[PDB]
């Protein structure tokens, strides 16, 4: 349909929309009011997500950036998702762990830093200066997969076994798929074209298809969603 | 002042006004802490709908769309306010309920879908997309509609006579004027200039103002909001 | 580095950068489930003043403005700060006083429509309408101020001699530096250009390290936010 990543952003558009029809089917009839806290959370992700891919399929959520000289095409969708979509995932996190109030707090808070910052960045002038969005932004990330880590584990640890290992693995994964994301974009389009718009897009898919549909699996999957 | 319509916006942004007046000097002095809730809730919807007429009838909610070749009229304003506004509703009917969390969640996030989606669409180029986004967002008002018409009403069924017989009321008002906004957004400047821009505009006006004051008349003179 | 206001933007910069760090560093193994909420709160708030700063510094929170016919340097930025800004800090002071839900919402709706109307006025090109939105601005915040003056307060009177006196003297910090931002912007670029860039920026440099900093030392240093 003209550019060369729209076939990434068309896989991307079904399995988020396939996704998010599959929990919603699945979360059907479930009773238990904690469960229905973590399908309406873990399946609102994917929601967003598939409204986002459309509109950069679409071109809505494409836009031209200028620095470094040339011309830079940089979708801004992304960050409209990851806004709502990131600390939504910390929700699940934080309610599979009876976190405090105010490490949530805190936690959302440092997530809208990290991509509010990681947006301005995409969209500054000074090539130079988008660094610097990025080092703050990356510095957001750290202490939020600090506190995911450290803290909530050790709060995981007073539950019973089925969630003390599901937060185990949710862990892992969003440590693991969240670090990933400030690399591919310090090497891609939005800070070096070291790395095609072509192969990055399709990067964040797999990235973004595994941190919400893959997390959604995990969690939706196990019985650690009951209060028992 | 210029434009056809300014009439319908300053008649909405006086009604929107008045209304908000009225809900703050009715609920003075209230000191039940549901019923403060209620109020709170009720009273900051028409304010909110009023900052936001004002900027349509001052023409600065107001930006131009290319589309269909001609020029279009988008007031933008709308979905500012409805962004906040319909949740807001949305809670109104939940806590008369006493909806659960999970529910409420789901149906705010729906219903954030159901606006975003609505205003991308609203500024899409490409006037055959402008449809698709609006089928996303019709999709999201159904599913709303959905919860509350046979979910909510469940819940209210559990509550005493006064509750149950006010969220009827507000069900069937909301139910009725919601499905009636994607209708005329459709057959709009918004979607087919069957209707235009002054009719719709008169529409919306009379939609908006049954929405929040007339749904703000039915639940703030009922001793419904008092849990007893 | 340009702009002769720059100066006062790197010292803001500086000043919330380190006013977090120092919370940060201050609030590092507390406990308490009350005073978590507190120290996340109150940290939060430098933390988005620093990001807003420093797009300020470094030109990205600035644009151009027309009206009164000669060009207007408008920094939106103060408004995307304050935005979070001010509620959180309406929130400290609600958890203080342990307000009740009701009146904690209207107070958050009533800062959203106050710094969601300041914006819209900073941004008008009708350089009469620009007041239109500053009264109604003014007058949301005069209904926060009263609110926190005489419903807090009585509030705060139900509590243990520490809380009551550093919730005085917060709220009397208060009330007067949110009181000045109008005054300001009134006579400022945002208004007339009675007051040049220059010397404004110096004054809500003073204000908003005022309100964050020299607020947040205040209630981080006494024992009212342990709930003992
Ligand atoms: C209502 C919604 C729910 C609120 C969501 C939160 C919101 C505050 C923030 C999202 C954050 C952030 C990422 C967005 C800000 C970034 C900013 C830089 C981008 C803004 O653009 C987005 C605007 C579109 O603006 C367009 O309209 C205006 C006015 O009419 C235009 O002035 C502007 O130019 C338009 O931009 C579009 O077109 C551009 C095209 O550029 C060129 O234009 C020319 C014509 O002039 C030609 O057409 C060119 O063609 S050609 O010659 O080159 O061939 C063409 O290139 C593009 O470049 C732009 O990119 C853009 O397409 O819209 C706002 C979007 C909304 C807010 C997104 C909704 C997202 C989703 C549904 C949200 C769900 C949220 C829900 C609330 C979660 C609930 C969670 C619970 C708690 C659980
Ligand atoms: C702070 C606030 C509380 C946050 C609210 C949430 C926020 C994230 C989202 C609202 C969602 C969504 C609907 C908005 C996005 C849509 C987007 C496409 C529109 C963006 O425009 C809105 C901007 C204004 O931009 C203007 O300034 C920039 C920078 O200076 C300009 O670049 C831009 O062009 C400007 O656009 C205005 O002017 C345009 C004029 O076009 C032409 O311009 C030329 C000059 O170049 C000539 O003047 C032309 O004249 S002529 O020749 O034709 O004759 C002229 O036509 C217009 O076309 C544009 O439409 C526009 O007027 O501002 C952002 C608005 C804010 C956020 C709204 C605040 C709303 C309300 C108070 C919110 C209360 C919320 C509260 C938080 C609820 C709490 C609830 C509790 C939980 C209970
Ligand atoms: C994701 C984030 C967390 C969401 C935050 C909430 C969000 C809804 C609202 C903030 C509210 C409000 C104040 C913003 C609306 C006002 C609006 C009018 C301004 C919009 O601009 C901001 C956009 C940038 O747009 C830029 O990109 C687009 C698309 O590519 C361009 O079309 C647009 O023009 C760009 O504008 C920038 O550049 C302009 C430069 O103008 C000229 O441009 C030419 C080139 O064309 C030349 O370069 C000129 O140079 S020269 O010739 O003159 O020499 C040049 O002047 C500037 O004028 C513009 O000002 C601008 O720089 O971005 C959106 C910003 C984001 C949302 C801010 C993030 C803030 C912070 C990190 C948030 C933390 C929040 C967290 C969620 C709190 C959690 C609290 C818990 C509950 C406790
Ligand atoms: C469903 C989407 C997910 C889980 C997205 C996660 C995104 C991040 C962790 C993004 C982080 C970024 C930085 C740390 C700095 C560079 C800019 C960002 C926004 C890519
Ligand atoms: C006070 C305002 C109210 C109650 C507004 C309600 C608005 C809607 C239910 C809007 C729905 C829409 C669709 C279902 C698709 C087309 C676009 C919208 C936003 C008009
Ligand atoms: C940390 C920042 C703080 C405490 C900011 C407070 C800002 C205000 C109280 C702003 C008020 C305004 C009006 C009452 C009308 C004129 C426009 C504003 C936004 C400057
Ligand atoms: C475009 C529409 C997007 C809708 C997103 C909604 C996510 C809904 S999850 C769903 O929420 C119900 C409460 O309504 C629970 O009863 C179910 O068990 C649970 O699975
Ligand atoms: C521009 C200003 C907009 C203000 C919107 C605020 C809606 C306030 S409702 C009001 O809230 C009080 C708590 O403060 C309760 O005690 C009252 O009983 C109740 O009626
Ligand atoms: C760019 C990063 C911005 C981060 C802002 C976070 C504010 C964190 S306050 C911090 O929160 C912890 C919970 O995680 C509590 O345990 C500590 O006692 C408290 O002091």
Redesign the interface.
């Known amino acids: 349909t003209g550019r060369p990543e729209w076939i990434w952003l068309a896989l991307g558009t079904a399995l988020m929309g396939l996704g998010t029809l599959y929990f919603l089917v699945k979360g059907m009839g479930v009773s238990d ?9 873990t ?2 992700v994917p ?2 997500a598939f ?1 986002m891919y ?2 950069m399929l ?3 959520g494409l836009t031209m950036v200028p620095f470094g000289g040339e011309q830079n095409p940089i979708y801004w969708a992304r960050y409209a998702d990851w806004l ?1 979509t990131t600390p939504l995932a910390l929700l699940d996190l934080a309610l599979l762990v009876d976190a ?4 949530i ?2 936690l959302v ?1 440092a997530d ?2 990290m991509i ?2 990681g947006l ?1 960045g995409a969209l ?1 002038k ?1 090539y130079s ?1 988008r660094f ?1 969005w990025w080092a ?1 932004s990356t510095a957001a990330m750290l202490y939020i997969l600090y506190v995911l880590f450290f803290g909530f584990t050790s709060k995981a640890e007073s539950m019973r076994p089925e969630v003390a290992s599901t937060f185990k693995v949710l862990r892992n994964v969003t440590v693991v798929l969240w670090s990933a994301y400030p690399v591919v974009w310090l090497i891609g389009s939005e800070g070096a074209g070291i790395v095609p718009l072509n192969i990055e897009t399709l990067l964040f898919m797999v990235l973004d298809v595994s941190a919400k549909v893959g997390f959604g699996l995990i969690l939706l999957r196990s019985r650690a969603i009951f209060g028992e």
């Open positions: 009011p904690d469960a229905k806290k973590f399908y309406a959370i399946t609102l929601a967003i409204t459309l509109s679409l071109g809505y709502f405090d109030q105010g490490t707090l805190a808070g809208g830093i509010g910052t301005v500054t000074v200066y610097v703050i």
